[PDB]
Design a protein around this ligand. Structure first.
Ligand code: HEM
Ligand code: HEM
Ligand code: HEM
Lengths: 157, 157, 157, 157, 157, 157, 157
């Protein structure tokens, strides 16, 4: 079903945001696992999977709308080298992506692509959940100190 | 454990190959799905997942060896626009990757990184399985004709 | 609860669209069944049932909103005499109905009837699924030819 | 128990026929498998296993009768390069083997080796089943054409 | 996938080794069974089956590599007439085959056919197991004497 | 089956490395248990058992190859007096043993003892896992401090 | 709890006896296994494991009593080269160990280390069981002759 060209361009931009997040979260996860921080591996792995599911939704929607999914352009990763830096980078990436979601959701409403909007609102809800988790963890590092915080990550939860 | 720098370089080059294949296979899968070719969606999706698993193994091994996984550089995709083209493109990608694996496996032996070699041989076995499947499907297109071939993809197997 | 009069007019228009679709899909289903095309009977039967469920939702919502559901006016059916024509007629009907759904969803937002809107967005998502299936089937007829296409319908899936 | 020398010669001749068939059917099976013709691999594999069971019966009977089983001489295989040729070669081999079975069954009756005869009649019944299947398949190739025939082999039955 | 011509010649040579062993083990097994030496029938039958599985692997690999499996040219059997002579012949055949495996495994590495090498290493492990069993049984004949040794074979283990 | 003398000597050297590690890990485990560090008792106990399984494999392989396993010479243990010292000693012992494994693995290939090599590669994989664990724990002591680290060991995981 | 220095010296001597026995029984077991004498492998393996459990008890007790377990000094093994010599060597080792146990049990009583004494009396019971088994087997070799004795070891019991 022929979709709106700019809606497809927004879907591709959002897809690109997910592609960056998949890679950044997955590498973060495996860094935490190498360091023995099992709890952080588990959460960041599942966030990577979430972003993969989002990417799939965008790819499927773009194809339905007769557009061309762009998996070729990968944007900048910001990996980081210690736990706080890694989490802050993930939070900044989520916030940037949420701004883009909000813009796309408004635009899709304007051109009456309500099913693409609906999909994007569900994805935004997921991202806000990730934002909550990241903000909270960052606060916990400050409140308990890094040594206690790292100890709290060695066992699965 | 401090690994061999050139082994790490190979692992990153192979990881790069997997990152391309993940995306190419996944987009191909969803293109087949959109077209109603369920059988091809199913196989290509699982090939994409296989390559994700390979990428994980490389990431984990690089980190163990105290190197930096590179998920930033994505090489060229070649998507294609019809089934035969798509399958031929996946086949050429697999064969390029197998050349690289053979080189890496010889080198790892020469510096006595036998565990990285062992890992890579298992991956190469996986890749040769993918090559067999692709070669066989391409021959089937020719033997039964494209119309019959497409009809044979519409149901799951 | 007294609803907005023009919301109710929209719900009655959409109900009208569903009533035409119920009958057109049902007759198509039983025509496919008569012809021995079991798979098309099954899909088209279940699309008819989907539209019945949508009609029920409209009737209940109209009554809640203190309007009068109109099941008396039936619009034009376009049955068709061969498989491709029948599927094309269903696709045209779905696309006309989607246009009407988009206008209703917009209008309901403007008068703050957000629950009628939510209902309608779910229904639109359903109809876009039907659109995807019909488009895909029509393309399959072309790609594999009508003889192979009809062979592919004789068994249930 | 000392058997009749010419009965033993017949059993060795028939064993020889089975040894050729085991190898010819097995290679055919794996050729079909390589080509993605799963249904033909399955049938031809099980025909190979049937001939292995027949060879075992001959070897055991010869030993009981105090003769020397000959597994050293292997007769001519005729592999073939396409499906029809391969099936025709199997059919010719089966028909040559049936002729030999008929002569052996007659001869065993004449010297009152009724248990060897009973064994051979069971084996002949098996081979006539294989003949029926091969004849039927070859006729199906002609009736539906080779493209449809090959399409019909790609899934297991 | 086109393989290296000399790798395929090695695989055919090894296949040839397996074809001889299949027949020699199977006849030995049934000779033991005729003699009432159940335990030796059981072991030798299962060794024959192992070699059948090895032959299958070679056939499938050769076909993948676009070579022609040779099941036509059966090498010399050495059956033997008493238990010790039979086991010694089996051992000599295993040792000859192991020499050939070692040569092939080195060559496959040199031309970077690492998957054919991996397969052959697994088969070599199997053959060394057979060698261990044979060497051990031959020593047991001498340690307990042949009358006790034969006694020890009449019941299954 | 007579093996290569130098391979047997390598296998005995490697066996010697395992015998030291069995004792060192076992004593470390029970020291951790005495101290109430249950998590460290559990891991180091299971590492000792791993090395016992490795020693068994070497003893079995050496005997198959007609050599004499040497369990008489025990090398130097370095026990240590506090958790970090104990773990660093285990790490140094593992790294020393890995060097010896790599040398033996290359030599076994050179003389075509591919089964001994396969065995040793599996053992090396196990050793690299122990190395990862030890490295990681040592880094965790530094990251969370010794007091928190010790607190993290008192409960089983 | 601060133990008596001389009790700890005895525990270390007994531990040393166990370490010799672990290695001697284990190697004996695997020699028997190599020879196909499965019953002897099974018994001698489990005796090795018994002595491992004894060693563990001594190590734990020594640590409780604030002594230093000595796993560094390994005493003389006497392996031997045929079944009778191997069992006689095991028996002589057991008898030597029982003398030391008796001395230690008396001493521990005299200094009121009744829990160490209780532990040692249980271990002595175990050793007298091993002594019974060994004496009995040696008598059986003589009574039935070595050829029959060896025959009786080839199956598990
Ligand atoms: C660094 C790159 C990636 C890695 C390491 C990775 C890793 C994984 C892993 C470990 C799984 C679970 C597979 C299993 O254990 O069966 C998975 C599944 C999956 N992947 Fe990826 N992936 C990557 C990129 C992608 C991309 C680019 C996409 C497509 C946009 C994608 C889509 C999916 C989906 C949809 C699943 C199934 C998730 C589910 O269980 O619902 N992945 N991936
Ligand atoms: C090309 C050479 C041969 C190949 C590749 C072959 C292959 C096989 C395979 C793959 C199996 C099943 C193995 C399993 O998964 O358990 C099998 C079973 C068997 N083979 Fe063979 N075989 C060959 C020759 C022979 C010959 C010459 C004999 C007789 C002398 C024989 C006797 C048997 C028997 C009796 C069975 C068990 C059948 C049953 O399931 O009842 N095979 N063979
Ligand atoms: C030649 C040296 C040794 C060898 C080859 C050896 C071998 C083994 C093997 C194969 C097992 C069974 C592992 C499994 O599969 O679960 C085992 C268990 C065990 N070993 Fe050892 N071991 C050796 C020395 C020792 C020593 C020196 C100790 C303590 C000082 C020890 C303590 C134990 C214990 C406590 C178990 C568990 C027994 C149970 O099941 O209760 N071993 N050993």
């Amino acid at each position: 079903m022929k979709g709106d060209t700019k809606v497809i361009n927004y879907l591709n931009k959002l897809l690109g945001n997910e592609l960056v997040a998949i890679n950044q979260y997955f590498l973060h996860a495996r860094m935490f696992k190498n360091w023995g921080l099992k709890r952080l591996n588990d959460v960041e792995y599942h966030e990577s999977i979430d972003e993969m599911k989002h990417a799939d939704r965008y790819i499927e929607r773009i194809l339905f709308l007769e557009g061309l999914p762009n998996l070729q352009d990968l944007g900048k990763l910001n990996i980081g080298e210690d736990v706080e830096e890694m989490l802050r980078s993930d939070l900044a990436l989520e916030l940037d992506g949420a701004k883009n979601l909000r813009e796309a959701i408004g635009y899709a409403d304007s051109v009456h692509d309500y099913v693409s909007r609906d999909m994007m609102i569900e994805i935004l809800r997921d991202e806000e959940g990730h934002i909550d988790w990241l903000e909270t963890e960052l606060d916990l590092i400050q409140k308990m100190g890094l040594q206690n915080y790292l100890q709290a990550q060695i066992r699965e939860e």
